[PDB]
A paper describes a structure:
For E. coli PBP3, a soluble version of the P. aeruginosa orthologue was produced lacking the N-terminal transmembrane helix (PaPBP3ΔTM). Remarkably, three distinct crystal forms were identified for PaPBP3ΔTM, featuring different unit cells and lattice contacts but all belonging to space group C 1 2 1. Diffraction quality was generally superior when compared to EcPBP3ΔTM crystals, with moderate anisotropy and usable resolutions of 2.2 Å (crystal form 1), 1.8 Å (crystal form 2), and 1.9 Å (crystal form 3; for details refer to Table 1). In fact, the head subdomain (T77-R152) appears to largely bend as a rigid body, leading to slightly different orientations. In fact, the final models for crystal forms 2 and 3 lack several side chains in this region as well as small portions of the extreme N-terminus because of missing electron density, whereas in crystal form 1, larger parts of the backbone could not be traced. In the TPd, the largest differences between the three apo-PaPBP3ΔTM structures concern the β3-β4 and β5-α11 regions, both of which show indications of high flexibility. In crystal forms 1 and 2, eight and six residues are not resolved, respectively, while in crystal form 3 nine residues are missing.
Subclass B3 PBP (known as PBP3 in Escherichia coli and encoded by the ftsI gene) is active during cell division and localizes to a multiprotein complex termed the divisome, where it functions in PG synthesis in concert with the division-specific glycosyltransferase FtsW. PBP3 consists of three major domains: the N-terminal transmembrane helix anchors the protein in the cell membrane, while the C-terminal transpeptidase domain (TPd) is the catalytic module of PBP3 and mediates cross-linking of PG chains by ω-peptide linkages between d-Ala and meso-diaminopimelic acid (m-DAP) residues on opposing peptide chains. AiCuris previously reported on the development of a novel monobactam (AIC499), which shows remarkable inhibitory activity against PBPs of Gram-negative bacteria, and good antibacterial activity, even against clinical isolates harboring several β-lactamase classes.
Numbering used by the authors: 56 to 190, 210 to 491, 500 to 561
Write the structure that this text describes.
């Protein structure tokens, strides 16, 4: 008997158990031996919770066999209660059942194991070799894995994303919380979600890890990165003015149209506040799409994350030797590419980390890796101040303001090309010394093609406020 291996424990970043192999008890029987004690069967059938006739049927039907299971997955205490009856032919072997104490809250991140206790999805699959040991014959146990997830932030993001969808009647949603300095994924919740313990049913739409496999056109949420390429070109400064009247711009056959068409002159910050597609397009025409593509590619948009998660969609950041005006514009205002919510959070973390990009991590980061300075500290600081103005200035996204803090971020309207409406908000806080980056995705707020609009911003406000408190970040907006 080459003994099996004990599956390693998965915890959150602070040791809270997320996937523990708990001991269970399995009762089996030798039918030829049980046949000599038929008068014990009604008592034994009752202790197993089974019908007297149906239980007697199983034994007599498999009388020539010498091994059948009576019941698997019992608790140690319940298994000893039946063994205490000392019915001839009833034997016991203690097994291991994978249990997930957090249940549906970390379902998509943790994943699950199959019948042969092998990693099938989530972390259970990405670290299956690490969590499963090797099978007298000596058997070594599996190693412990501590995730980057903060279970406190995870519970917060889960219930706030759930409460927001029920309030608006949305079909689905995603929320990613990220530590901008360490690259750690502090929280990643998806709706709808399933219970990995209660897998009698198996709804396929609930097992969808949308934060990593759903791709969408980020829209205005990448305009800060176009602005970053403008500021790094040496041709634009924050006081420069762009004329966006009358809210439309004709480029040959196509016509760029702004969502709000009530502006004429805007400075660079007002282009972000008003979220003008015309304004960001005129900037892109001057600096060229290559400088914008380079920034988006360096912050990870459309790039492999390196997390090794199953089903991870990379997205698509198109590249061209020669960029026409149409492809330049659509890239500049976020409809010329497709990303995941994880990639968008990673890119915002770089901007918040004063322009230094750090590799994503699903496990706890002890030694912080050397970053890549993608955006200069001076340009990153300037864009940070602009995104703070997007949230705090006149006509800005006021629903995203965090009480007692200076928050910064950008709202968008994603499109999955038949097309699908998603509401986006990506941000970080505190604006004056960023610690946390967050991306909120809401699939069709009211309905598919509705008029809800800014629905993700209030979720950003409530979750960021809680995450800053849970991490004891000092308030920097004390009036």
């Amino acid at each position: 008997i080459a003994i099996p291996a004990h599956r390693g424990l998965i915890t959150d970043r602070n040791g809270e158990p997320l996937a523990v192999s708990t001991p269970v008890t399995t009762l089996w029987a030798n039918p030829k031996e049980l046949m000599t004690a038929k008068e014990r069967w009604p008592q034994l059938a009752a202790a197993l919770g089974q019908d007297t006739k149906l239980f007697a049927d199983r034994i007599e039907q498999n009388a020539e066999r010498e091994f059948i299971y009576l019941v698997r997955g019992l608790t140690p205490e319940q298994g000893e209660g039946v063994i205490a009856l000392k019915v001839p032919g009833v034997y016991s072997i203690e097994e291991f059942r994978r249990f997930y104490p957090a249940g549906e809250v970390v379902a998509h991140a943790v994943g699950f194991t199959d019948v042969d206790d092998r990693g099938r999805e989530g972390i259970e699959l990405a670290f299956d070799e690490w969590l499963a040991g090797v099978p007298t014959k000596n058997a070594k146990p599996g190693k412990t894995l501590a995730l980057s997830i903060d279970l406190r932030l995870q519970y917060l993001a889960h219930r706030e994303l759930r409460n927001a969808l029920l309030e608006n009647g949305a079909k689905a949603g995603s929320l990613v919380i990220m530590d901008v300095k360490t690259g750690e994924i502090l929280a990643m919740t998806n709706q709808p979600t399933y219970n990995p313990n209660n897998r009698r049913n198996l709804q396929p739409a609930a097992m969808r890890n949308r934060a990593m496999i759903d791709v969408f056109e980020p829209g205005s949420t990448v305009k800060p990165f176009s602005m970053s390429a403008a500021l790094a070109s040496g041709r634009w400064k924050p006081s420069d003015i762009v004329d966006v009247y009358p809210g439309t711009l004709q480029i040959g056959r196509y016509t760029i149209r702004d969502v709000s068409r009530n502006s004429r002159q805007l400075d660079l910050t007002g282009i972000l506040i008003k979220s003008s597609n015309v304004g960001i397009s005129k900037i892109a025409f001057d600096i060229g799409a290559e400088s914008i593509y380079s920034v988006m590619q360096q912050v990870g948009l459309g790039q492999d994350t390196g997390l090794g998660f199953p089903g991870e969609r990379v997205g698509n950041l198109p590249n061209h030797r020669k960029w026409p005006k149409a492809e330049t514009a659509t890239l500049a205002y976020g409809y010329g590419l497709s990303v995941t919510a994880i990639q968008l959070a990673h890119a915002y973390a770089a901007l918040a980390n004063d322009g230094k990009s750090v590799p994503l991590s699903m496990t706890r980061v002890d030694r912080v890796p050397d970053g890549v300075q993608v955006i200069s500290p001076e340009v990153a600081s300037t864009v940070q101040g602009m995104l703070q103005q997007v949230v705090e200035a006149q006509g800005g996204v006021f629903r995203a303001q965090v009480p007692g803090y200076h928050a910064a971020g950008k709202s968008g309207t994603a499109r999955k090309v038949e097309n699908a409406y998603r509401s986006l908000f990506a941000g970080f806080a505190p604006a004056t010394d960023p610690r946390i980056a967050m991306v909120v995705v809401i699939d069709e707020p009211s309905k598919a093609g509705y008029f809800g609009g800014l629905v993700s911003a209030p979720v950003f406000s409530k979750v960021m406020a809680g995450a800053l408190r849970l991490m004891n970040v000092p308030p920097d907006n004390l009036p």
